[PDB]
Curated annotation (Swiss-Prot), chain B:
The gene is Ephx2. CDD domains: HAD_sEH-N_like. It comes from Mus musculus. The active site is at D276 (nucleophile), Y408 (proton donor), H466 (proton acceptor). Disruption phenotype: In knockout mice, hepoxilin turnover to trioxilins is greatly abolished. In livers, the activity toward HxA3 (8-hydroxy-(11S,12S)-epoxy-(5Z,9E,14Z)-eicosatrienoate) and HxB3 (10-hydroxy-(11S,12S)-epoxy- (5Z,8Z,14Z)-eicosatrienoate) is greatly reduced compared with the WT mice. Bifunctional enzyme. The C-terminal domain has epoxide hydrolase activity and acts on epoxides (alkene oxides, oxiranes) and arene oxides. Plays a role in xenobiotic metabolism by degrading potentially toxic epoxides. Also determines steady-state levels of physiological mediators. Bifunctional enzyme. The N-terminal domain has lipid phosphatase activity, with the highest activity towards threo-9,10-phosphonooxy-hydroxy-octadecanoic acid, followed by erythro-9,10-phosphonooxy-hydroxy-octadecanoic acid, 12-phosphonooxy-octadec-9Z-enoic acid and 12-phosphonooxy-octadec-9E-enoic acid. Has phosphatase activity toward lyso-glycerophospholipids with also some lower activity toward lysolipids of sphingolipid and isoprenoid phosphates. The lineage of its organism: Eukaryota, Metazoa, Chordata, Craniata, Vertebrata. This is Bifunctional epoxide hydrolase 2. The N-terminus is blocked. The covalent modification of cysteine by 15-deoxy-Delta12,14-prostaglandin-J2 is autocatalytic and reversible. It may occur as an alternative to other cysteine modifications, such as S-nitrosylation and S-palmitoylation.
């Protein structure tokens, strides 16, 4: 089966026609005097040349102005002398946006396993606000398998060639497909052809229910679009001889590098990658040193924080970027605050999820502070090479089902006990019921990803306690003045909100966010909220 | 032997207790007035940077050791950009505010050497304060003082090493010191590219028989001009897919695969700049997808829409200087010729407008070979370097020439397709740059362009052949930027 939706009216709102009305009436003219040129059944003259893409938009402006003027005062209704459908058109088109519960509805049946597509009487917009159309088309691009623009194939609606063509392409029966239009007039030949006829009047809503009817039912407030994965661009920068950083790119300027934590990947930002791009940013979801597709040198000094933060600038340098908004989480969160602290120039901004900014005490061995905190026992476990590796690597499937679990779920990790029992996955089963937070596929990704690096490299992040301490002690007399945002997770066992109360001592103006009922895996666990926040922040500052 | 420079006022001009350490790095900026503008209002010293890349290219160890500071300022980015840019030309960056030891504290000099790993006589220090050069000469270093805006300066420079020009070529990005993108637009098909700079986007599209490396001279500059550059490897070339089938290189297919490329990358609009064959594609991009095109620029290639009542083929058969195009028309043949010895093949193709050893564009069929007239070991063009050539060899050693040649082999359908937009006009911003001495693709072939593209802005480079970019880069840049800036 397949679903195909018209853009203006069903996937995109408010229909361009809408404004055609409030311009007709607005300009006091005979019902459909203007919507005539647009949709009427007998497309002739200029607009027929338009949807067929014989002439572009700007051309069609004059041709149509004058053609209106014919039927104008020179045939009933008084159309002003100095009148033009150009600015009313481009503005109503620019002022039109995506029908989420619809696009949402579309992504569903695609997930369900449907043939998702759009069939619209399009045109080639060479206008000033020609971009608006491009963005709407850029982002809609993913969700649909096929795009049949009247202005590309040369057969406007409701001429049958298009419908008869919509099928040859979809290679299917007309009953096999369902047609969503907002004119009904374009729907007549669709029904008559043995296809499903659903008039998208309203704003979906009801057409969403007489829609639920066949196929299935759709969410109430679904999950934000997660970039997923072969469909993405893959960057590769070589910052130093043996060392190269892999990453994923989406969206256009300005730049914001998403840095992940232990034991994850760039795929962790899957839910934020798209949205943020769409938020109007060039996203760079990077695979941190030692992870997935970037270099994983075995040596430990190789993961010193000083080294990673510097290798971070080298990364921007080679890419030719002078400044980025750094958004860290978990371990990276640390790095990220360090980025802000040591390279403010290259940092347009900083955001940390869960990780507070915890500068060291000069008169307190770094090690002792770990030995003291009871919930950092695992950190000590890790401290020894070969050991934790051996445990985590043994059966990667469990290892992840174990680590990634919600705040309200059993099958946990032994952050407290670790050392005694000799593991974190020592009291965990050998078949952890898969978290309601991940999918077997999502898990499998991480497996393959780690099947390439093992865990040494990632673990070595922990193993630099001392020098990391020695280094960061250099900025104890500094303040973090570039824009910062700290987001805390209510139920994150290690890395608890409480660990940040004294943050403003160093980071005044530090703006803040807080997600409730949320565990460690902030992004994967409460994405929509993570997004809302991150965007608002980016927009606002 | 190595060389050091001091940002403070040597690689960047106009020159610029509690400061005794802001520099050492204990305190930041705002951790402190009208001095920020001063920093902003300052920039790179091109002959110095030039001089530097010279020595770097001469096989020296290039570096900067400066009394820095950390900027949490508002005009912070200015510093980034300068630093972002200088970065590629220096090996080590010894910034006071980083290793904690301002100049002239002798620890820095001691450290620059331990870092550099060499004798103090093996290096030459370039400071503009001289009071910072005492210890340097003291240590047994080579001290040059930056008094003039770098004249008698880089003069004493030329002395110690050798001669750097005055009006030089613009810095050429490379080689693998660049980012490498990879997008998979369709099952077997993926497009490789190179990225530099931050927004907005401009995709540089190359011609036959080249690569993204062809834009080497424009890639940096343009980034620095304030743009996110995407020097792409066209279908069939270098690191992107090279499917053997011909239909696979139809123009309609490439222009569409072009939108797919922007889509996956999440970009809604780009400025498309084409040259040679791509130039064609690029104008088609403008013609079929104006939405995704913020702009269009073509180098050499005019916009030549087809005649409905004139078989496309006949127009090639008619023009005498498109004989080679006919040669190419047959599969296996031209491949076999060009592939045989790639070294010659490129030395032959890439030559200036004022050089012999040419290509048989005219008599290709007749002599049966676009190289038959070409020497056997073409004296390497003064326009390329053995290394630059070698790049292209390896690049093509991966795809052969079928894929690239198939660009030619779609004459008919390309015609049939483009005939769809004969009733259209190109209204998005366009710029046509013509090359005086480009044998095929002569300026003359564009006089009627505005018939279709009014407002079409224009540029023209003199004494220039086909390889516009490689041949007259600085002029190409000047123009492309001015255009981008202005529109
Ligand atoms: O796996 C981790 N890893 C945390 C590293 C935290 C950290 C990073 C940097 C400095 C101090 C602490 N945390 C989760 C595991 C599942 C239960 C709750 C904590
Ligand atoms: O290699 C080429 N290739 C040109 C393809 C030109 C073209 C492509 C599409 C439409 C019209 C013309 N040109 C050089 C060859 C060596 C001598 C100068 C021209």
């Amino acid at each position: 089966r397949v679903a195909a939706f018209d853009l203006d009216g069903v996937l995109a709102l408010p229909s361009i026609a809408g404004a055609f009305r409030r311009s007709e009436e607005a300009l006091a003219l005979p019902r459909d005097f203007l919507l005539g040129a647009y949709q009427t059944e007998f497309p002739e003259g200029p607009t027929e040349q338009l949807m067929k893409g014989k002439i572009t938009f700007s051309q069609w402006v004059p041709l149509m102005d004058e053609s209106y003027r014919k039927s104008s005062k020179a045939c009933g209704a008084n159309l002003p002398e100095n009148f033009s459908i150009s600015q009313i058109f481009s503005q109503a088109m620019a002022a039109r946006s995506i029908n989420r519960p619809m696009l949402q509805a579309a992504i569903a049946l695609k997930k369900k396993g449907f043939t998702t597509c759009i069939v619209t009487n399009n045109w080639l917009d060479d206008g000033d606000k020609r971009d608006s159309l491009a963005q709407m088309m850029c982002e809609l691009s993913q969700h649909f398998d096929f795009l049949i623009e009247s202005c590309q194939v040369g057969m406007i609606k409701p001429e049958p060639q298009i419908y008869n063509f919509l099928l040859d392409t979809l290679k299917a029966k007309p009953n096999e497909v369902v047609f969503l239009d907002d004119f009904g007039s374009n729907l007549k030949p669709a029904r008559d052809m043995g296809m499903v006829t659903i008039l998208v009047h309203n704003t979906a809503s009801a057409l969403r229910e007489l829609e639920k009817v066949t196929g299935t039912q759709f969410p109430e407030a679904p999950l934000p679009v997660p970039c997923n994965p072969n469909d993405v661009s893959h960057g590769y920068v070589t910052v130093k001889p043996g060392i190269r950083l892999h990453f994923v790119e989406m969206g256009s300027g300005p730049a914001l590098c998403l840095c992940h934590g232990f034991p994850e990947s760039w795929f962790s930002w899957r839910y934020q990658i798209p949205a943020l791009a769409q938020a109007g940013f060039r996203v760079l979801a990077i695979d941190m040193k030692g992870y997935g597709d970037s270099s994983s040198p075995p040596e430990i000094e190789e993961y010193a924080m000083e080294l990673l933060c510097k290798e971070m600038v080298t990364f921007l340098d080679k890419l030719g970027i002078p400044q980025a908004v750094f958004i860290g989480h978990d371990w990276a969160g640390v790095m990220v605050w360090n980025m802000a602290l040591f390279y403010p120039e290259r940092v347009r901004a900083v955001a940390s999820l869960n990780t507070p900014f915890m500068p060291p005490d000069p008169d307190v061995s770094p090690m002792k502070v770990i030995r003291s905190i009871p919930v950092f026992n695992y950190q000590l476990y890790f401290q020894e090479p070969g050991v934790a590796e051996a445990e985590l690597e043994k059966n990667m499937s469990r290892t992840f089902k174990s680590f990634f679990r919600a705040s309200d779920e059993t099958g946990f990790i032994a952050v407290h006990k670790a050392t005694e029992i000799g593991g974190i996955l020592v009291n965990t089963p050998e078949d952890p019921n898969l978290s309601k937070i991940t999918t077997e596929e999502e898990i499998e990704f991480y497996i393959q990803q780690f099947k390439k690096t093992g865990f040494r490299g990632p673990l070595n992040w922990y193993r630099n306690t001392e020098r990391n301490w020695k280094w960061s002690c250099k900025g104890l007399g500094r303040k973090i003045l570039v824009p910062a945002l700290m987001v805390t997770a209510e139920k994150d066992i290690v890395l608890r909100p409480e660990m940040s109360k004294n943050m403003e001592k160093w980071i005044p103006f530090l703006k803040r966010g807080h997600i409730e009922d949320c565990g460690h895996w902030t992004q994967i666990e409460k994405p929509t909220e993570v997004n809302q926040i991150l965007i608002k922040w980016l927009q606002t500052e």
